[PDB]
Write a protein that binds this ligand. Structure first.
Ligand code: SCM
Ligand code: K
Ligand code: K
Ligand code: MG
Ligand code: MG
Length: 163
RNA sequence: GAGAGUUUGAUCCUGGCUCAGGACGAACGCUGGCGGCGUGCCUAAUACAUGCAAGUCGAACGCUUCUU
């Protein structure tokens, strides 16, 4: 668990989807907002908020995202190793990149990575474009990412021996 | 190793279609200052006026026309 407090979190509105519930009189229109809130230092989360008005949906989503913050391993400006994250339709593949290459990624993955604070990475989305699913798939891949120190500790060998 | 639009009242998935890039012996439209380097019948191996694109050797040979 990562406490939102003590972290200077900033948010970005990934998607604002106007959803409809059909009611006897007609259409009941609501706004569903997907938000990604991150620390630019390795912590990031995503939250969903539904409300009659766009600002309120965004605010609800922001609070949810803070609750869901997670930490991403990072070696320099890029991730430790290649990782594929799959959630539902979403399917993302993210690879380390050389320094200065930038963030090669599309749409929602861009927000997740920027907010997380990763500056250089290569990513490809092999699944659907559904923003919620791709964001979920992104965080799944990041949770798969492993630290050299943790791996070295787990396997019982020095990190130098591992590499 | 970037995506985006579009099926629905709304949603996820599947799925096609379309677009954002680059390329060219290009052509067309509008427009048009210069220079360097390059390229220019992709079609009818269709038909071709005209001129030229294969001559040279007198130290292999015998002739023949003029200059004093
Ligand atoms: C018989 N009275 C109806 C009934 O109460 C409906 N709710 C069950 C009620 O529904 C509404 O309140 C609605 O929300 C829909 C609207 C077409 O009619 C409205 O009035 C509707 C009332 O007129
Ligand atoms: K349509
Ligand atoms: K599609
Ligand atoms: Mg939830
Ligand atoms: Mg020809």
């Amino acid at each position: 668990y990562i406490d939102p407090k003590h972290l200077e979190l900033e948010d970005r509105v990934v998607a604002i989807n106007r959803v409809t519930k059909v009611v006897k009189g007609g259409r009941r229109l609501r706004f569903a907002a997907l938000v990604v809130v991150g620390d630019k230092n390795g912590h990031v989360g995503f939250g969903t908020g539904k409300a009659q008005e766009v600002p309120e949906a965004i605010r609800k989503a922001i609070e949810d995202a803070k609750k869901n913050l997670v930490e991403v391993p990072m070696v320099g400006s890029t991730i430790p190793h290649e990782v594929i994250g799959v959630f539902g339709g979403g399917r993302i593949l993210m690879k380390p990149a050389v320094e200065g290459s930038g963030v090669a990624a599309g749409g929602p993955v861009r927000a997740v990575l920027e907010l997380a604070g990763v500056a250089d990475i290569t990513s490809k989305s092999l699944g659907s474009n559904t923003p919620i699913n791709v964001v979920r798939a992104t965080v799944e891949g990041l949770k798969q990412l492993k630290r050299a120190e943790e791996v070295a500790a787990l396997r019982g060998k020095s990190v130098e021996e591992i590499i």
